[PDB]
Amino acid sequence: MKLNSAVTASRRKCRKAYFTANAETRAKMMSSRLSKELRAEHKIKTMPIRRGDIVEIFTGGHKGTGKVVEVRRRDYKICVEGINQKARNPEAKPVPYPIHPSNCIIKELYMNGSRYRAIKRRQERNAERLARI
Amino acid sequence: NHTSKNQNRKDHRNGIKKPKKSAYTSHKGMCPKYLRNLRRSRANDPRQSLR
Amino acid sequence: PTVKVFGPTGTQVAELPRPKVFNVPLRPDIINFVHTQLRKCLRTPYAVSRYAGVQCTAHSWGPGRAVARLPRKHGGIGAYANFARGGHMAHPTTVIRRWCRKVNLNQRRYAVASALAASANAALVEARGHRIADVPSIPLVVDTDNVTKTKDALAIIKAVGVLRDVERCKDSRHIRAGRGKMRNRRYITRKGPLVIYNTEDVARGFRNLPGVDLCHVSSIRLLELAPGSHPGRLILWTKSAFASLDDVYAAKQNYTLPRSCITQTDIERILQSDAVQKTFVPKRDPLVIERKVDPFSSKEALARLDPSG
Amino acid sequence: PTRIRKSRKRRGHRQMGYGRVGGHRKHPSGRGKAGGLQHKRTSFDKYHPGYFGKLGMRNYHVRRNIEYNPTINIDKIWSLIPEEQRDGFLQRKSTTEAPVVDVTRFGFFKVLGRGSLPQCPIIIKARYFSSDAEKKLREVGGVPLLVP
Amino acid sequence: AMGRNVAFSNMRRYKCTNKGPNLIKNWFNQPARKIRRRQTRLQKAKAIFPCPLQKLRPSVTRCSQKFNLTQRIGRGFTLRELQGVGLSAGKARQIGIAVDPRRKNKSEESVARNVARLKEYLSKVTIFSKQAKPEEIQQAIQHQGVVMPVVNPKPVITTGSIAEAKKEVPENLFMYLRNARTARNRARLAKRDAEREAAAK
RNA sequence: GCUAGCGGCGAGCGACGCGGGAGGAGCCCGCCCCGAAGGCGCGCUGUGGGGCCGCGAGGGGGCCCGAGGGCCCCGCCCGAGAGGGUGCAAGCCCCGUACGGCGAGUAGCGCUGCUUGAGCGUGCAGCGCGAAGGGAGGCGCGGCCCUUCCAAGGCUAAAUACGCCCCGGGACCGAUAGCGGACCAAGUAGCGCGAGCGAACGGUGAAAAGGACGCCCUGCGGCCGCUCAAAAGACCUGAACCCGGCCGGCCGCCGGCCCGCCGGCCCCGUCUCGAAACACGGACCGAGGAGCCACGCGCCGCGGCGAGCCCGAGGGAGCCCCCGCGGCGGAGCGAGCGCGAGACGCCCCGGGCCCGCCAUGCCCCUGCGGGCG
């Protein structure tokens, strides 16, 4: 259970905090599972979703793999290239079907440099925890 | 305004209550001289309750 | 009478005498009363705002305007009444209410003792709803050394017959049926064993096990001993807890345990005793009623009353 | 327990247990104990004797501690003595070793006599002793000593 | 109930119920108050870790003929009592003894009670000085609660000789007691009669 | 303590002292001694001294569903099965949680007024008059004591109270409720010259995918259909009242029957002696709407314990556990000084006696005292 009083366990307080959260917190909330292959390489269970990430949806209808073309933190959803609603008119511009990032597994990551620096900081912090704190 | 109709039916609902056994035989209003002498007669031989 | 102690392995490690609390007469009424009173004392006060419906300015318009005489605002809107929309409730709730009920110490102790005693009755536990078929003995006394891992505790519980009760709790979690879901009370699970621990640091190991609760012999809780004002909870005593029960229950100033009583079976055996049956005298044979039929009409019927006729 | 209440059962009856010819109205007998010398004299005379008037001398301040005088009967003096000591004392008797009980130390200042002491002699110490108490303890062969 | 036999209520009518100062004092903060006082107490204890939180206070007869038999704890030791041990007031305060110049013993037995209490405390107290002595300070153990808590001893029966005891008590003690009690009234009335006798001839 | 008192002694009003606790801490000036030693443009008309920052476990297959978080089999992590989110009800999908790190115009007194439970004054005040060793001790006055203290100068922590605001919890309310106000714009829109008053208004869907096309129409708009699981299409469900089509009857209720005939039926509520009343209220329907709580009292039932009984406030790395005073009862009665119950008795009830109070008569010590009738 929770032994800390500072964190709220109220449904009302929790939903308001998620529904209206700062963008820094929206990022962590919008994390996604690193693949078995990536996890072995980087030693991090889940990394926050980015706009160059290629991800494989594993539950929702539309279970394919694509790059993340757009991230809309306000809608708490990400848009994956190639997963769209059926464009009624054939000669029409596609509308992306937003997928939640929980429903996805990160096949590839946009390596960047800050991503690499962030991956390392966790690797040493997790090592302190693995050293039984 | 004054009227006593239904008084007798109300009185006889469960009435005609007799006075009580203690009332018939009581030491109230009796001659004080009779009462004093009665206590002395009682206070001797079997009737005496004195220790 | 000594209660068998089974170790984490599950095999009769030692024997311990029965604490005399388990000889206390089983009173369900004393338990229910103190349970009801102590649940009320935990209740947090609720009330409406004193300034609700009084914040507006409304005056009865008055007779003659063809409108009912209830306070109405500038517009002519009904206000300030239990029947008016936006009005104060006729008797507003206040926190001045008595949310707590006092209990005499003796009566509280009598209840706590009769609840621990109820745990010993084999059927009381099954009646309450615990699954106790695989449990070897009641009370369950298990010598478990300090346990800090759920898997170690789970093995103890599996090897002593309580896994089915823990599984009844695990597979009983559902969303609630009311506004309580919204009011931070969304999930309800079935209540399971109570592990009484003395100096055996098994609290960390057993805490996340589903439905199971822990309580130091220093402070047994009657709302725990009888969940739902229904006594009969499987209690997995640590061996220190049983060996300390005669101490805990004597350290109560000069509190003397309520004297043992009788049971319906022990009133039935007493009733069937030869002396009681010998006193019984059979009664007179009863009356024959027989609904009236016309006697005059039939020859056989008339002969019972008028044979010569 | 609101559920198990007379008012809830009487819902559906209109007047709610208060009558039709006379209805519940606000204070129709006046508020408080009022009119006890006028309209309610019947009740006040019948059940309240001595309610109206002044009957005694007045002490502007009452000093409870000095007006406090706790009393013990001659029957409970032996009860104060602990049982283990008391049971032997009664068989042993003895003028030299007669029990001394300072009822003041137990918490009582004056000894009254309501019952009978046991025959074994006892010395009682108290601030005051009723005459019947002095006589009874003197009959049991005891001494009514005073205490400071 | 409605009239009939009811003792009259002596509870005063509520005042300032709608407007005015709050005359209702709720106690839902009571459990929280308990945790607060312990937390303030724990913080204070650490600030003077070797020293007991409570200062030594004196045994004092409880006032009135009602409680004159028992003893309780008073504000401070009298200057005479401290002088009997040999401690000046300021030196005593450093040791931990509270000092009250106002109190007067009122007896010679009261002084003896407290001088003995002061003597015992002096033995129990250990003065940790020597600049810093951390090892001794670590195992110092802070005394918890009231220091030397007063003990009120229960009455114990004693053995006495009826013959010697009957020597002090006059025979007919009640007459002796009732005469002493009424002597003032009897004496005044007989003086009142002497004036009447003087005022007849 | 809850009653000493106060009050057309009426209605009502009403402290403190003990006792148990939390908390505790003592001092300083004037006066007087020095006399500038001082804070030195002053001052000898006296200065100075005596909280943040983190990591963070472990789930697959089958079937189906618009989509599992569903089911059916098997597993794994719990110092984490508190919660929230995610296309349905998720310990293992995401976040988190458990586990971490860094003393004089005075006192007094006279007269008045206000006030207090304070009563021939509880404190204050005006004016008049005014001390010296004084104050008090709860019935005034004048003596005599006895206990206790030193007013007319000043400081002082702690324990206590409490809103905005922030944080957390709730046997709280669920949009006519809950704050007036859940709505990106509420003290807002509006109103009153102004002081002031003061609303209404929550919900599409998982994703706007918020409507492909064609047909026509002078055109509007309609029509198909489309998207979607569904139109859910300006929105969740969509009741009652009320109304339009189409179909079916001739009809208020109650009973018998095949069913439109016979029989019976005044309009409720409400005051009232009496209502169908030419008494009153009621167009209709929906939602809301009225003996609740606190405290005191009387009595009853129960439960614990019993000449006892008692979660008082509080205090115990203590949580519903433990320890924990008054009080109330056990003795009454009398204005009070005071004095002070045993003799019976299943129970009840009378009688008899005992205790106090009001007398009376006797006897005698430690005497208006005691005892006895």
Task: Report yes or no on chains A and D touching (3+ CB pairs under 8 A).
Answer: no
In our burial notation (b when 16+ CB lie closer than 10 A, e otherwise), range C90-124 reads: eeeeeeeeeeeeebeeeebbbbbbbbbbbbbeeeb
Q: How far apart, in whole angstroms, are the C-alpha atoms of residue C233 and residue C118? A: 8
E69 contacts D105? CB cut-off 8 A: yes
CA C228 to C1' F173, in angstroms, rounded, equals 26
CA C46 to C1' F56, in angstroms, rounded, equals 38
Binding positions of C for Mg(2+) are 70
Q: Give just the sign of the alpha carbon dihedral E25, E27, E32, E37.
A: positive
Residue nearest to nucleotide F309 (CA to C1'): C104
Confirm whether any atom of chain F, the nucleic acid strand, is less than 7 Å from CB of D54.
yes
Nucleotide nearest to E42 (CA to C1'): F317
Q: How far apart, in whole angstroms, are the C-alpha atoms of residue A101 and residue E143? A: 60
Distance from CA of D148 to the nearest CA of E (A): 11
Residue in D68, D100, D129 closest to E160 by CB: D100
Rounded to the nearest 5 degrees, what angle is found at the Cα of C70, between the Cα atoms of C66 and C74? 80
Report the DSSP beta bridge partners of residue C17: C2
Task: Report yes or no on chains A and E touching (3+ CB pairs under 8 A).
Answer: no
A92 touches chain C (CB under 8 A): no
C chain contacts of residue E26, beta-carbon cutoff 8 Å: 95-96
C182 touches chain A (CB under 8 A): yes
CA D148 to C1' F333, in angstroms, rounded, equals 28
D110 touches chain E (CB under 8 A): no
DSSP characters over chain A:
----SSS---HHHHHHHHHS--HHHHHHHTEEEEPHHHHHHH--SEEE--SS-EEEE-SSS---EEEEEEEEGGGTEEEETT-B---SSTTS---B--B-STTEEEEE---TTHHHHHHHHHHHHHHHHHTT-
Q: CA dist E52 to A124, D36, E44, E49, E56, Å?
A: 47, 63, 10, 8, 9
- Please give the resolution of this entry in Å, rounded to 1 decimal: 3.3
E168 touches chain D (CB under 8 A): yes
Confirm whether any atom of chain F, the nucleic acid strand, is less than 7 Å from CB of A33.
yes
Strand F near-CB residues (< 7 Å), D 69-108: 69-73, 75, 108
Q: Give just the sign of the alpha carbon dihedral D137, D142, D146, D148.
A: negative
Nucleotide nearest to C225 (CA to C1'): F320
Does B15 show up as a binding residue in the annotation? yes
User: Element (H or E) spanning E71, and its range?
Assistant: strand E71-73
**Judging by DSSP bridges, how do beta strands E158-160 and D98-102 pair with one another?**
antiparallel
**Contact residues for E100 (Cβ-Cβ < 8 A; gap 6+):** E74, E75, E76, E77, E78
CB pairs under 8 A between A and C: 9
Q: What tokens were used for E193?
A: 């009669």
Confirm whether any atom of chain F, the nucleic acid strand, is less than 7 Å from CB of C100.
yes
Nucleotide nearest to C209 (CA to C1'): F81
Residue nearest to nucleotide F101 (CA to C1'): A133
- Give the method used: cryo-EM
Q: Which of D144, D146, D125 is nearest to D134 (CA)?
A: D144
Q: Count Cβ atoms below 10 Å from residue C308 Cβ, excluding itself.
A: 4
Q: Which of C214, C209, C211, C210 is nearest to C197 (CA)?
A: C214
Please provide residue D92's backbone torsions phi and psi, each rounded to the nearest 5 degrees. -70, -35
Report the DSSP beta bridge partners of residue C3: C16
Three-class secondary structure of residue C188 per DSSP:
strand
**Contact residues for C28 (Cβ-Cβ < 8 A; gap 6+):** C114, C231
Strand F near-CB residues (< 7 Å), D 57-76: 57-62, 64-65, 69-73, 75
Distance from CA of E172 to the nearest CA of D (A): 8
Q: Which of D108, D142, D112 is nearest to D124 (CA)?
A: D142
Place of tokens 């012999």: C217
Nucleotide nearest to A7 (CA to C1'): F168
C186 contacts A11? CB cut-off 8 A: yes
The separation between CA C203 and the C-alpha centre of its own chain, rounded to angstroms, equals 25
CB pairs under 8 A between D and E: 76
